[PDB]
Design a protein around this nucleic acid. Structure first.
Ligand SMILES: O=c1[nH]cnc2c1ncn2[C@@H]1O[C@H](COP(=O)(O)OP(=O)(O)OP(=O)(O)O)[C@@H](O)[C@H]1O
Ligand SMILES: [Ca+2]
Length: 424
DNA sequence: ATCCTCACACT
DNA sequence: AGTGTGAG
């Protein structure tokens, strides 16, 4: 069982919010620029950065004021604000443009506002029978890198050398060769990426491999505006120096414990342990997953799911902006409930379904964790005043204050979330 | 003073 | 149901 049954791609829009703003405002094209939210505190928080600005050191989560120290000519586009909170609708609508195009080529799984997994297995099978048995020209793969090549006895020049070595050794007469299947998968992804750019103006990167984790890793290897094929055979060398934290799901505490408990640094070092050893350190499911994944094997399916499952609306109130009065809390709960009603109504029309549970969460000043508490209640009518009233009710007892008009401890986060949908 | 958005495992 | 982890 070598984990080679499927062709999976991951498509990731390059600096997506920046591209949306650069399409809209040509003055921002081909310039060091960034997208910011909330201009008042330190110039705004940077949420997306063009590759020209990344060369100066500008990164996501920097304050715009600090970004300008690294890049004085940095241009900024600011996110829309509605009811006091950053409003992402422009980027959501641009994302829909891209996913609709991807959907023409294969069933997609939306992974975020700007990435989607593609299961290409059947598309490849149909393209292979249409290809008689003729060779795949390098001209069909004008932006594809073959990871690990060239090898043996300028950037674009070597892309082609590696692609030449790959195609020169392809066994085209075998319609079940995994390497050939990946190659046809990459041809299709070239076509999909060309269609995205033609029809929206947006560029993207992509990974093509045998599963979602390798496809995601592949996609990051040659960014921006390129795609990377990671074959099963490329995995031992690729993983031999790959930090464990770079593999999807190992970027946090679990990945840190793998490194600490086992005393290793790279993904390939996991192969020396038995599956029972890994299960004894990390649990049955994590140990089995790690045993397969360090050999390049992962089975998480591309889920036929193009749109999300919950719709939620939150806002942070950091520092001295924490909410302290009952009618501050009710006002911001109303603001959140209003935009939630707006997105729920749109979701009832476009997608034909109705949310039926409302989740209310708060953060108290002094608490360490993203959420201090989560309560639910019924969601039956898409009406903001009722929802904000209901949300107040399920949290009105968290108020440790003896005063009715005061709220203590002060609130640093409010969150309203609609869940449990049914067809409509 | 990163700030949202969403998914899923565990209990 | 409520909490915690991980990611874009
Ligand atoms: O830490 C985060 N807090 C909030 N939101 C985040 C965070 N991290 C990512 N996001 C969201 O995920 C979109 C694409 O995130 P991304 O990592 O793909 O970044 P880009 O496309 O800008 O650059 P590239 O892909 O070229 O690196 C971003 O806009 C943003 O909405
Ligand atoms: Ca992206």
């Amino acid at each position: 069982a070598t984990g080679q049954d499927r062709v999976v791609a991951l498509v990731d829009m390059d600096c997506f919010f920046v591209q949306v703003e650069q399409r809209q405002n040509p003055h921002l094209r081909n310039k060091p620029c960034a997208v910011v939210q909330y201009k008042s505190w330190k110039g705004g928080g940077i949420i997306a950065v063009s590759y020209e600005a990344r060369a100066f050191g500008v990164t996501r989560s920097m304050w715009a004021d600090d970004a300008k120290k690294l890049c004085p000519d940095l241009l900024l586009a600011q996110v829309r604000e509605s009811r006091g909170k950053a409003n992402l609708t422009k980027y959501r609508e641009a994302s829909v443009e891209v996913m609709e195009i991807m959907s023409r080529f294969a069933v997609i799984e939306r992974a975020s506002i700007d990435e989607a997994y593609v299961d290409l297995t059947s598309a490849v099978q149909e393209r292979l029978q249409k290809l008689q048995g003729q060779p795949i020209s390098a001209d069909l793969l004008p932006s594809t890198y073959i990871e690990g090549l060239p090898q043996g006895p300028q950037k674009e020049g070597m892309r082609k050398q590696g692609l030449f070595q790959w195609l020169d050794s392809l066994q085209i007469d075998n319609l079940t060769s995994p390497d050939l299947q990946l190659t046809v998968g990459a041809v299709i992804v070239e076509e999909m990426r060309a269609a995205i750019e033609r029809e929206t103006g947006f560029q993207c990167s992509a990974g093509i491999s045998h599963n979602k984790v390798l496809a995601k890793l592949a996609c990051g290897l040659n960014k921006p505006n390129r795609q990377t094929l990671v074959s099963h055979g490329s995995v031992p060398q690729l993983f031999s120096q790959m930090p464990i934290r770079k593999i999807r799901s190992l970027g946090g505490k679990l990945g840190a414990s793998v490194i600490e408990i086992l005393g290793i640094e790279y993904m390939g070092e996991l192969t020396q342990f038995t599956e029972s050893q890994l299960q004894s350190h990390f649990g049955e499911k994590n140990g089995s997953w790690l045993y397969a994944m360090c050999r390049g094997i992962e089975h998480d399916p591309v889920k036929p799911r193009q749109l999300p499952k919950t719709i939620g609306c939150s806002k942070n109130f950091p520092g001295k902006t924490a909410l302290a009065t009952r009618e501050q809390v009710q006002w911001w709960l109303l603001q959140l409930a209003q935009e939630l009603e707006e997105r729920l109504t749109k979701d009832r029309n476009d997608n034909d379904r109705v949310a039926t549970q409302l989740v209310v969460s708060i953060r108290v000043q002094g608490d360490k964790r993203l959420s201090s508490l989560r309560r639910c209640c019924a969601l039956t009518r898409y009406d903001a005043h009722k929802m904000s009233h209901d949300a107040f009710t399920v949290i009105k007892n968290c108020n440790t204050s003896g005063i009715q008009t005061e709220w203590s401890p002060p609130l640093t986060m409010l969150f309203l979330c609609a869940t449990k949908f049914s067809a409509s």
